[PDB]
Design an enzyme around this catalytic site. Structure first.
Site, PDB file in Angstrom:
ATOM      1  N   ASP A 202      27.059  35.616  36.774  1.00 35.79           N
ATOM      2  CA  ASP A 202      27.233  36.992  37.226  1.00 35.79           C
ATOM      3  C   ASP A 202      27.677  37.019  38.685  1.00 35.79           C
ATOM      4  OD1 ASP A 202      27.146  39.615  37.782  1.00 35.79           O
ATOM      5  OD2 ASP A 202      24.990  39.872  37.463  1.00 35.79           O
TER       6      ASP A 202
ATOM      7  N   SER B 174      42.617  46.140  45.491  1.00 39.10           N
ATOM      8  CA  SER B 174      43.803  46.072  44.669  1.00 39.10           C
ATOM      9  C   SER B 174      44.873  46.985  45.249  1.00 39.10           C
ATOM     10  CB  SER B 174      43.454  46.527  43.257  1.00 39.10           C
ATOM     11  OG  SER B 174      44.603  46.627  42.435  1.00 39.10           O
TER      12      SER B 174
END
Ligand SMILES: O[C@H]1CNCC[C@@H]1n1cc(-c2ccccn2)nn1
Ligand SMILES: O[C@H]1CNCC[C@@H]1n1cc(-c2ccccn2)nn1
Length: 330
Positions: free
Chosen positions: A35, A199
């Site tokens: 994770d 992004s």
């Protein structure tokens, strides 16, 4: 040193991925959910409340000759899906794919919430976010990656998650045969303890790319792709019959639909998520309404590039002094 381990989807929907981990002496092999969005290595154990164990493999520290109770240490964590777990702490030897760390904090669960009990395939979590998020008190503990880093050939790990297929976590090296083209690296902020990056934009299907900054996290421990409501609305508008369902809890779509791809930007590079990766199947057994794999982050407070996005890429988690993230197509 290096390590390399295969990671496997837990079910036919790729709802999560498990990776075998050796703990203790003699080894006890548990299948953990790696994770990159959290920083605790915790396991189902011989100490877990019996009614909260249903099929998981447990760690029994009393059978490990290298286990040592960490005096006075406890842990307690909550996750964004509403789940939680807590317990006490041992140090022990932990190996992944041939890479060994001695003295790793292994957080033994005394309590887990119902979602963990109900998932017989996941024996615990191995956190790979930054150690600043580790929950052990009163002395915070380091992640497996942080403990291994100085011994690794290079201070990196990579995630190569499969779509309906096995994949790989590598530590200490970049397998140049595992991706196509080049790896584009992008800046990381560790201010929230995550692999947080920006992004450069997105496209839906064959549509034009929209240049816009989307700050979010690379999170292997979250299944879906959670993005701003405007972006998610633009995606589902291209799927005839798709709707946001308050009762179901997000966008659903007719199971007969063919979904468009979703592209996200990494610098000037582009990662294309095929439409099929966004199908999470019937909302309940036998339904012809299907759950979408791209959902709004509005209620979260952060955008999450979860498994839906990451499995479309070869992802480098570069833990050099200034961390960065790399993405390549594959
Ligand atoms: O669990 C958290 C661990 N640190 C990184 C963010 C992650 N995360 C997941 C979710 C979420 C929200 C709605 C539905 C399902 N998962 N929110 N935050
Ligand atoms: O992110 C995941 C981390 N491991 C625990 C479950 C959690 N999770 C999954 C979903 C989900 C998956 C498919 C369709 C609708 N929801 N919601 N939360």
């Amino acid at each position: 040193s290096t390590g390399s381990a295969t990671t496997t989807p837990i079910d036919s929907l790729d709802d999560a991925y498990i990776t075998p981990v050796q703990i203790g002496t003699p080894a006890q092999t548990l299948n953990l959910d790696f994770d990159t969005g959290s920083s605790d290595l915790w396991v189902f154990s011989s100490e877990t409340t019996a009614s909260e164990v249903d099929g998981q493999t447990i760690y029994t520290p009393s059978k490990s000759t290298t286990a040592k109770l960490l005096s006075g240490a406890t842990w307690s964590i909550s996750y964004g899906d509403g789940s939680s777990s807590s317990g006490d702490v041992y140090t022990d030897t932990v190996s992944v794919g041939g890479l060994t760390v001695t003295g790793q904090a292994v957080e033994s669960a005394k309590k887990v919430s119902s979602s963990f009990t109900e998932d017989s395939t996941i024996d615990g979590l191995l956190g790979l976010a930054f150690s600043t998020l580790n929950t052990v008190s009163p002395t915070q503990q380091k992640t497996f990656f942080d403990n291994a880093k100085a011994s690794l050939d290079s201070p990196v790990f990579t995630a190569d998650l499969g779509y309906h297929a096995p994949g790989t976590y590598n530590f200490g090296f970049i397998d140049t045969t595992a991706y196509t083209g080049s790896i584009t690296y992008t800046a990381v902020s560790t201010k929230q303890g995550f692999w947080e990056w920006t992004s450069t934009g997105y496209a839906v299907g064959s549509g034009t790319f929209k240049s816009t900054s989307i700050d979010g996290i690379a999170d292997t421990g979250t299944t879906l792709l959670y993005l701003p409501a405007t972006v998610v609305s633009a995606y589902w508008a291209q799927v005839s019959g798709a709707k946001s369902s308050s009762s179901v809890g997000g966008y659903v779509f007719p199971c007969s639909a063919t979904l468009p791809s979703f592209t996200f930007g990494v610098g000037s590079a582009r990662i294309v998520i095929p439409g099929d990766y966004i199908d999470f199947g019937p909302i309940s057994t036998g339904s012809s309404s299907c759950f979408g794999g791209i959902q709004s982050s509005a209620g979260i407070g952060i955008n999450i590039f979860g498994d839906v996005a990451l499995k479309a890429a070869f992802v480098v988690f570069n833990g050099a002094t200034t961390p960065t993230l790399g993405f390549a197509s594959k």
